[PDB]
Design an enzyme around this catalytic site. Structure first.
Site, short mmCIF file in Angstrom:
data_model
loop_
_atom_site.label_atom_id
_atom_site.label_comp_id
_atom_site.label_asym_id
_atom_site.label_seq_id
_atom_site.Cartn_x
_atom_site.Cartn_y
_atom_site.Cartn_z
N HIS A 251 65.62 97.39 30.49
CA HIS A 251 65.52 96.48 31.62
C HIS A 251 66.13 97.02 32.90
CE1 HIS A 251 64.37 92.21 32.28
NE2 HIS A 251 64.04 92.23 31.00
N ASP A 252 65.82 96.33 33.99
CA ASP A 252 66.56 96.38 35.25
C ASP A 252 66.99 97.75 35.76
OD1 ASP A 252 66.15 93.65 35.18
OD2 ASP A 252 68.24 93.12 34.85
#
Length: 423
Positions: A251-252
């Site tokens: 993620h991210d």
């Protein structure tokens, strides 16, 4: 027109290679102290006014086993830490009743000769490392003391132990079984590699975290793997079976990841493998992702410059591969087979290159490309913007035996097909 993709060399990612990555020559300090003294623990638990849950789990002022200034193996902790906190219930089997924190200058190892390490659910045990940590040939499981077994999943908000690593850390897990870790709570998803929270990283300026997870098995996890602003992490040769929400969930703003030769299946709620919110310049290759509640492989939220190659993507209950608002990616030579919906679905993504893909016997279309306005949804369009165009180049491969037809591309800005086999 194009040459085969150039994929990273996995020959060096070995349990044997892993073992030679930490400094054993200098021991080795062990303390048992208050958790709220430590940044690595404050950083996800928050202020002092959030310690209540932990005070209840530990029945007292919250404490942790702490490792720093040197090298300490599990067997070392057992000798120095009180039984009531770290207990050897049988030869090589330990129950930990406090969380273990590996500090910044700490180096923590669990090798073989550790049959199984049991993290007590009731006492709120878990592992955080802000330093060096190696786990080889062993088992670390979320353990229910009351049930006398694995902390089997029941509901999202019931705490279970987990592993989390912070910024500036390095972590290597090999030939290791883990089960029943993680629950619906920030930084506590299962095995979590994370940069610090934006404010704290503004102060510590540690490097982005990294490491490898190889040849291991992860079952019943809330997420099998999660990461946040992580660099160059390797996930090779693992089995992710019967996890709850995601198999592998990078993620991210993570980048340069290698996710390879994994067998990811049986995910109960969502996807097998999903990279979300700017996971860029990474590599998803030679995985089997099959039989997940949603899609096999997902690239989401402006995750770009990635290569998804030679994966075996089959029998997922929705799409084989889904690209959501994530353009400039290369799907080369995947075999996408008998997923209940679409073989490969591209939504709101441009400059997708689909070269040499085979897509057979999917419930719907082999390849489906579409646009959708996302303005009156629960989507944060400030954080994750979208443009509603779709364009792809398709070269070679085969589209056959799909229920609804070879391909459908609605309102494309451009599609080019060259040399594609359709039957």
């Amino acid at each position: 027109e194009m040459a085969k993709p150039v994929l990273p060399d996995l020959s060096g990612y070995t349990t044997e290679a892993a073992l030679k990555k930490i400094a054993r020559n200098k021991p080795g300090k062990i303390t048992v102290a208050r958790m709220m003294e430590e940044t690595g623990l404050k950083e996800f638990i928050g202020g002092d006014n959030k310690m209540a849950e932990w005070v209840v789990r530990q029945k007292g002022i919250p404490q942790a086993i702490m490792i720093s200034d040197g090298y300490v193996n599990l067997q070392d902790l057992v000798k120095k830490v009180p039984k009531q906190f770290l207990s050897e219930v049988s030869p090589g089997v330990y129950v930990a009743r406090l969380p273990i924190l590996v500090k910044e200058t700490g180096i923590f190892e669990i090798d073989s000769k550790t049959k199984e390490l049991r993290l007590s659910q009731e006492k709120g045990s878990f592992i955080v490392s802000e330093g060096k940590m190696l786990i080889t040939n062993t088992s670390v499981n979320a353990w229910s003391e009351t049930r006398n077994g694995l902390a089997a999943y029941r509901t999202p908000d019931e705490f279970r132990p987990f592993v989390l690593t912070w910024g500036g850390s390095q972590t290597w897990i090999a030939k290791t079984k883990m089960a029943s870790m993680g629950y619906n709570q920030s930084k506590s998803y299962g095995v979590s590699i994370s940069q610090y929270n934006p404010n704290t990283a503004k102060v510590l300026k540690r490097g982005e975290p990294t490491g490898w997870i190889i040849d291991s098995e992860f079952a019943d996890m809330w997420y099998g793997f999660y990461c946040y602003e992580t660099r160059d992490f390797v996930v090779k040769g693992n089995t992710y079976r019967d996890n709850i929400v995601y198999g592998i969930d990078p993620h991210d703003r993570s980048h340069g990841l290698i996710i390879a030769e994994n067998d990811v299946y049986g995910t109960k709620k969502k996807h097998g493998i999903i990279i979300s919110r700017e996971v860029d310049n990474s590599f998803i290759f030679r995985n089997k992702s099959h039989n997940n509640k949603l899609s096999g492989v997902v690239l989401d939220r402006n995750s770009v410059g990635n290569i998804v190659a030679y994966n075996e993507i089959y029998q997922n209950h929705t799409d084989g591969i889904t690209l959501y608002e994530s353009g400039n990616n290369l799907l080369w030579g995947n075999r996408v087979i008998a997923n209940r919906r679409h073989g490969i679905r591209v939504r709101n993504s441009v400059n997708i290159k689909l070269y040499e893909n085979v897509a057979m016997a999917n419930g719907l279309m082999g390849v489906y490309g579409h646009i959708k306005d996302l303005n009156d949804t629960d989507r944060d369009i400030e954080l994750d913007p979208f443009d509603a165009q779709v364009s792809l180049i398709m070269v070679g491969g085969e589209l056959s035996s799909n229920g609804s037809g070879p391909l459908s591309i609605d309102s494309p800005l451009s599609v080019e097909l060259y040399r594609v086999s359709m039957l």
